């Protein structure tokens, strides 16, 4: 089967937000915020919720632009990731225990200390299309297969 992440990108006209990951599965790589979907909340729900934790941001509307699916050679569950994108947001954001936040200009994404599926369908988020990603890891650092195409309804 699978399971339902969030990833959260704050994207405004010259710079986009990242956190450096200081704890947990991809500690040190810089990242949308997000994690886990809980029983009792929806997915846009969930991610308002690790946005807040991770950076003590607010949302006034997050929009639906990606989803993908992860496969880890060996994990039993599929990582459904469904991305989410917003320009206005409400705070300044602050560290948290699992993020460092930092704003990128959109010519300096820093792809080489990202997950390397970024490389790949980031310039779609940053482009405005909606998308569909697949791919397949082997460990944290080996793309096996993937799959990327744009979609009407994400
Ligand atoms: C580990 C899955 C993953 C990812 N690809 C990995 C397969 C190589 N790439 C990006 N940008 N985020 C990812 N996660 C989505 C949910 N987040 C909250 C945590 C991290």
């Given at each position: ?6 990833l ?61 699916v ?22 300044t ?42 791919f ?19």
């Amino acid at each position: 089967a699978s399971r339902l992440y969030t990833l959260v990108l704050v994207l405004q006209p010259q710079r986009v937000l990242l956190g450096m990951k200081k704890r947990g599965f991809g500690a040190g790589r810089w990242n949308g915020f997000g994690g886990k979907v809980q029983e009792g909340e929806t997915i846009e729900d969930g991610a308002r919720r690790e946005l807040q934790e991770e950076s003590g941001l607010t949302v006034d509307a997050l929009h639906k632009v990606g989803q993908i699916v992860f496969e880890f050679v060996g994990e039993p569950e599929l990582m459904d990731v469904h991305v989410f994108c917003t320009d206005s947001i409400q705070g300044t954001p602050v560290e948290s225990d699992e993020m460092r936040p930092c704003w990128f200009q959109l010519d300096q994404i820093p792809f080489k200390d990202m997950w390397p599926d970024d490389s790949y369908w980031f310039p779609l988020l940053l482009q405005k299309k909606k998308f569909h990603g697949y791919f397949k890891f082997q460990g944290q650092d080996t793309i096996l297969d993937y799959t990327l195409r744009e979609v009407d309804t994400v």
